[PDB]
Design a protein around this ligand. Structure first.
Ligand SMILES: [Cl-]
Ligand SMILES: [Cl-]
Length: 129
C-alpha cells in the first residue's frame, strides 16, 4: 500500500507514535517519506547482505528474520515479511523498540540526513489529526 501523507500521520497517531520518546509525529512522517516514499512494500539490499523492509526500512541484521541474513538477532521477533503489510502495526511496534535502544531516531539514515533539524511540523500541516 502507498499511503497518503495525512493518512499515514493518522495511522501513526492511532498507534502511539506522536511524541513517542519525545519525537513529534512530523519526525515519523518525514522518516517514512524518505525511507520508503510511504510504500509498505519497499525493500532495499545492503552491502553486508542485510535487507531493509517496509515503510520504516527496518534492517534484517538486528530487528527481523528474513532467513538469509547470517547472525540475525531478530530483536522484534517477527518475519521481515510481516513489515510489508498494508497494516503498519508490526512496523510501528518494532520501530518503538528501535527508537528506545539508545541512539533514538538516528538509527534511520534518512531521518538523520533529511529530517533532523528541519521544520518537521510541515509534514503534518493540513491534516485532520
Ligand atoms: Cl510534528
Ligand atoms: Cl532520543
Amino acid at each position: 500500500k502507498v499511503f497518503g501523507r495525512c493518512e499515514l500521520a493518522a495511522a501513526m497517531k492511532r498507534h502511539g507514535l506522536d511524541n513517542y520518546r519525545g519525537y513529534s509525529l512530523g519526525n515519523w512522517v518525514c522518516a517514512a517519506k524518505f525511507e520508503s516514499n510511504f510504500n509498505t512494500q519497499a525493500t532495499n539490499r545492503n552491502t553486508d547482505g542485510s535487507t531493509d523492509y517496509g515503510i520504516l526500512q527496518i534492517n534484517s541484521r538486528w530487528w527481523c528474520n528474513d532467513g538469509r541474513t547470517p547472525g540475525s538477532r531478530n530483536l522484534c521477533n517477527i518475519p521481515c515479511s510481516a513489515l510489508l503489510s498494508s497494516d503498519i502495526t508490526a512496523s510501528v511496534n518494532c520501530a518503538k523498540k528501535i527508537v528506545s535502544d539508545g541512539n533514538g531516531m538516528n538509527a534511520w539514515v534518512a531521518w538523520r540526513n533529511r529530517c533532523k533539524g528541519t521544520d518537521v511540523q510541515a509534514w503534518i500541516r493540513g491534516c485532520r489529526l
